[PDB]
Design a protein around this ligand. Structure first.
Ligand SMILES: [Zn+2]
Ligand SMILES: [Zn+2]
Ligand SMILES: [Zn+2]
Lengths: 81, 360
């Protein structure tokens, strides 16, 4: 029971690294509350994900989806999952 | 399918399956292909297919002739502008910078660290190449040294870049000790990973591999069905349907120690059958989206020009300009316009009904 590696030919894609850990719609940290809930002060403010793997507070991406339909961060229509 | 088959045909001619094609005569047949092309409706479909096709050739050195390849890029650019052969030429220049980049990594290693394997990598610019993310793959320990050692190397190279490893395109070479003879296996990186697993036990279930290689079973199933094709691995029943007998998360896999082959270097890295379909479907979706981008582009070239225009006049211009690359569908341009407003590139003139204006 023994295999060994003599060669490995790898393939990679280089891009610029953009660290987006905010909600694109209300602009504050995903991991804390959205703008609208800090207006309401004092678990039901979750983050929704799209087939595009982009994430926004579920609260924002709703109000946003009221007037628009293509993900705030790409060219495709927004799709939950 | 006609504009697609023409591209697939070009692959045929500029691909080497080891048999050398007379140089000069192919120049005539390339120039022949270029004439059946000018008579194509959905040019843009040929483009996507001929790029994704030129892609597989470059990455695997599988190119019949260095000269023919660029010969077709001077014809295509002369027949569809520099938009059509923008990404193409960038892929050539990319492979070259990669070649240069690799060496520059060997030297840095030559003077400093050891390497347990012969490593070779192709960095490609995340934009030009028609490839996609792998499938959540768990990296084998031996390769990992070459991973981190390069990722760290690259961090030095550039300020804000990032690497995205495409394991579903990476290959390599295993060497066998556990068989009658000494074989050199030419295996995909998915393969290598399941083979290195039999360096402890000699049998796992379909569910145990998915847990130790993180390979989504969908793709893990198609792979094992190749590892059973070659008698490298086998199951409890040495008679089952080699093609039709689907596996289950509970079906076992056994390392066949009776491996025999009439040659020392084998190629087990064969194209699996569900690939020429799945990659076709994905390319179609990328075309459909590419058209949408082309259109937004038109809408903006036009709106930018005549600062105000009525919906119907817009549609007609957009068709006029794109007519040479393809046969746009009306409902789409509608949608592109709409998106363009959500993007704030153009707005609706209040009072006016379906008159749009560009937002400088
Ligand atoms: Zn938010
Ligand atoms: Zn909220
Ligand atoms: Zn998105």
């Amino acid at each position: 029971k023994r295999f060994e590696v003599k060669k490995w030919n790898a393939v990679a894609l280089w891009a610029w690294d953009i660290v987006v850990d905010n909600c694109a719609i209300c602009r504050n940290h995903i991991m804390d509350l959205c703008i609208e809930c800090q207006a309401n002060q004092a678990e039901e403010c979750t983050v929704a994900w799209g087939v595009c793997n982009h994430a926004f507070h579920f609260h924002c991406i709703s109000r946003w989806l009221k007037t628009r339909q293509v993900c705030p961060l790409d060219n495709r229509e927004w799709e939950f999952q | 399918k006609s504009p697609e088959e023409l591209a697939r045909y070009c692959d045929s001619l500029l691909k080497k399956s080891s048999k050398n094609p007379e140089e000069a005569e192919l120049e005539d047949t390339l120039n022949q292909v270029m004439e059946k092309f000018k008579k194509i409706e959905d040019k843009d479909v040929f483009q996507k297919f001929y790029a994704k096709m030129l892609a597989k050739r470059l990455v695997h050195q599988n190119s019949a002739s260095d000269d023919a390849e660029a010969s077709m890029i001077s014809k295509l650019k002369q027949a569809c502008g520099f938009e059509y052969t923008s990404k193409l030429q960038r892929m050539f220049q990319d492979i070259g910078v990669s070649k240069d980049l690799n060496e520059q990594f060997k030297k840095h290693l030559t003077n400093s660290e050891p390497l347990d394997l012969d490593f070779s990598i192709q960095v490609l610019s995340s934009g030009s190449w028609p490839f996609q993310q792998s499938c959540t793959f768990a990296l084998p320990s031996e390769l990992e040294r070459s991973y981190q050692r390069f990722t760290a190397f690259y961090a030095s190279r550039h300020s804000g870049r990032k690497l995205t490893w495409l394991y579903q395109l990476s290959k390599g070479e295993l060497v066998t000790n556990c068989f009658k003879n000494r074989y050199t296996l030419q295996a995909s990186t998915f393969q290598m990973a399941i083979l290195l697993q039999y360096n402890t036990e000699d049998a796992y279930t379909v569910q145990q591999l998915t847990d130790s290689t993180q390979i989504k079973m969908d793709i893990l199933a198609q792979v094992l069905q190749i590892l059973l094709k070659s008698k490298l691995l086998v199951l409890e029943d040495e008679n089952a349907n080699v093609d039709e007998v689907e596996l289950k998360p509970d079906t076992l896999i056994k390392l066949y120690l009776g491996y025999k082959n009439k040659k020392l270097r084998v190629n087990i890295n064969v194209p699996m059958k569900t690939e020429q379909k799945q990659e076709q479907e994905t390319t179609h979706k990328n075309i459909e989206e590419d058209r949408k981008l082309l259109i937004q582009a038109a809408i903006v070239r036009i709106m930018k020009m005549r600062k105000v225009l009525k919906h119907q006049q817009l549609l007609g211009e957009v068709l006029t300009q794109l007519s040479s690359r393809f046969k746009p569908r009306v409902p789409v341009i509608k949608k592109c316009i709409d998106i363009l407003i959500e993007k704030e590139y153009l707005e609706r003139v209040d009072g006016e009904k379906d008159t749009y204006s560009y937002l400088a």
